[PDB]
């Protein structure tokens, strides 16, 4: 299917506590592959997926360099916004940015992205044309005028349409086993008596990748959608995900109930019932 590269940047001032801290993580699809933390032993760009390790010393230098200057410049950028909003240098502030590529299943660019938040609030976002911005307020209009007047504006866009797409396609090849084979959920239903006349049926989806999944409970034909407890999809800790859906049923009547599982790694949807044993 489609694929995405994303870099997530967090820059947090901590006045009186230290210098502003800068963290970058990178993702292909739902797999994190690089990490940088300006508080590290010696700040380096560091691998976090098998396939990124193929990259030579040339690579880890550029990315560490970019992140080292990111660390310097985002401290400057927090000061600007401190200035834009007329803020005390005593309070703590957060700047967040996301940006990257989307490519189709044949590897053609679909979309570029560049969005930033400041103290959790949307601040500036790149537009679909990748060559104009939308600003949440007059502070961000200042940033918009600087970014739009820059001699470099074309090279900003050229990154999203060029180098960003090239590395995404490369990564998707270096880790094509990893990144291009969806792992279907190992599925189970479990029975949990509540009283003498009510039991909880819990439908488990485990070890799946990517994270997108749908778990529906059906009493007979139709969906128990208002009586279904769903937890949020959650990381297993090993680059896969878990999720469960649960419903309370009349203690005698477990077979009226089916769990419907859809996931990219499943040929057709699954349907599970409670199999006592």
């Amino acid at each position: 299917g489609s694929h995405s590269m994303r870099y997530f940047y967090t820059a947090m001032s901590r006045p009186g506590r230290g210098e502003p801290r800068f963290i970058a993580v990178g993702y292909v699809d739902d797999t994190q592959f690089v990490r940088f933390d300006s508080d590290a032993a010696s700040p380096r760009m560091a691998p976090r997926a098998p396939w990124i390790e193929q990259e030579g010393p040339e690579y880890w230098d550029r990315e560490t360099q970019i992140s080292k200057t990111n660390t310097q410049t985002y401290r400057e950028s927090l000061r600007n916004l401190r200035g834009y909003y007329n803020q005390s240098e005593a309070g703590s502030h957060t700047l967040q940015r996301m940006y990257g590529c989307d490519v189709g299943p044949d590897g053609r660019l679909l979309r570029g992205h560049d969005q930033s938040a400041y103290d959790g609030k949307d601040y500036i976002a790149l537009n679909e044309d990748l060559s104009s911005w939308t600003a949440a307020d007059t502070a961000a209009q200042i940033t918009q005028r600087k970014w739009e007047a820059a001699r470099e504006a074309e090279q900003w866009r050229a990154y999203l349409e060029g180098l960003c797409v090239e590395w995404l396609r490369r990564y998707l090849e270096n880790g094509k086993e990893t990144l291009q084979r969806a792992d279907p959920p190992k599925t189970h239903v479990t029975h949990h008596p509540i009283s003498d006349h009510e039991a909880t049926l819990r439908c488990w989806a485990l070890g799946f990748y990517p994270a997108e999944i749908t778990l529906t409970w059906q009493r007979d034909g139709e969906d128990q959608t208002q009586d279904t407890e769903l937890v949020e999809t959650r990381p297993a800790g090993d680059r896969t995900f878990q999720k469960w859906a649960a419903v309370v049923v009349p203690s005698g009547e477990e077979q009226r109930y089916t769990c419907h599982v859809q996931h990219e790694g499943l040929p057709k949807p699954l349907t599970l019932r409670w199999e006592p044993s």
């Binding site: 870099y7 970058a24 090279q155």
Partner: peptide, 10 residues
């Protein structure tokens, strides 16, 4: 790979 231009100042 990161874009160096997104170190540009706000």
């Amino acid at each position: 790979a990161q874009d160096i231009y997104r170190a540009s100042y706000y």
